[PDB]
Amino acid sequence: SLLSNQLHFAKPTARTPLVVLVHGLLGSGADWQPVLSHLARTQCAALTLDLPGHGTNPAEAVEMIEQTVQAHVTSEVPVILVGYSLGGRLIMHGLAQGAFSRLNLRGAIIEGGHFGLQENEEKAARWQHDQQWAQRFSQQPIEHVLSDWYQQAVFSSLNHEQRQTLIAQRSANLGSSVAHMLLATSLAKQPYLLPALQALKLPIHYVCGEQDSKFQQLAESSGLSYSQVAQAGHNVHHEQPQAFAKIVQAMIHSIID
């Protein structure tokens, strides 16, 4: 069993790194098409994947990501893991646990992934918050829930037309499957990851949008190398796919000739 997946551009090899792209809650591998359009010019292979409960197919998610990437490479192929939001957190969690140790990992790019909450008080509040969203996704019309989801602060950069486009695209999701994934990977349950990450020899690069105050402050205070993208909020790969692809290219350039 693999996650739903698609290989792009080229055969992964020692000379052609594999860029693994992992979307966030409500998204799918199709979210990466704008970035891939720009990355096509760079010698690499890319792998898009659908997280459990997502796509046209509605420790565990992490294992399945590792297995799906492993199915496309040998130990000689350099791999870059790129994750947006939940996808970022899944990658960071795997990295903190040593879960990708049988891949030739050469870098990671994390776009708006939360390192975790530090205090039981916040974790409790987060669990309530996540349960309330999950119930909404379970039992209310998805377009109603999505209309509120896209009013969250992380999406402050978006205009009405952008929000409406996303509401429409995301309304294909199965509400119950979204809710389960939300809870199963709730931030409330996440160990704080930043110390484990800081200790890795692997280069880890954080990407934030300048208009996303919450994740810009996380990026800025993390001590990790980071890009802060002008004229973008949380979802940089949607808002500024060319700038995002340039960041991925820079890491590819850093690992091979």
114: nearest Cα among 139, 134, 137, 87: 87
- Give the full edge-to-edge strand order of the sheet including 204-209: 5-8, 45-49, 18-22, 78-84, 104-111, 204-209, 225-229
Using the 8-state DSSP alphabet, how is residue 192 labeled? P
**Considering its fold, how many domains does the chain have in total?**
1
In the chain, the N- to C-terminal Cα span, in Å, equals 34
**Pair of tokens at residue 187:** 């931030």
Q: What is the CA radius of gyration of the chain?
A: 17
Say whether 63 sits in a helix, a strand or coil. helix
Q: Are 182 and 127 in contact (CB under 8 A)?
A: no
Helices (H), 109-191: 120-139, 142-149, 160-170, 175-184
Q: What distance lies between CA 139 and its chain's CA centroid? A: 26
d(CA 166, CA 153): 15
β-pair partners for 80: 19, 107
C-alpha torsion angle, residues 41, 246, 112, 140 (rounded to 10): -40
Long-range contacts of 55-59 (CB under 8 A, 24+ apart): 55/4, 55/28, 55/29, 55/30, 56/4, 56/28, 56/172, 57/4, 58/173, 58/174, 58/177, 59/97, 59/99
**Pair of tokens at residue 107:** 């870098």
Helices (H), 150-240: 160-170, 175-184, 194-198, 213-222, 236-239
Task: Domain of residue 91: give its range.
Answer: 1-257
d(CA 6, CA 48): 5
- Report residue 235: phi and psi, to 5°: -95, 70
Q: Are 55 and 22 in contact (CB under 8 A)?
A: no
CATH number at residue 233: 3.40.50.1820
d(CA 30, CA 95): 24
Q: Are 54 and 12 in contact (CB under 8 A)?
A: no
Please give the single-letter amino acid code of residue 234: H
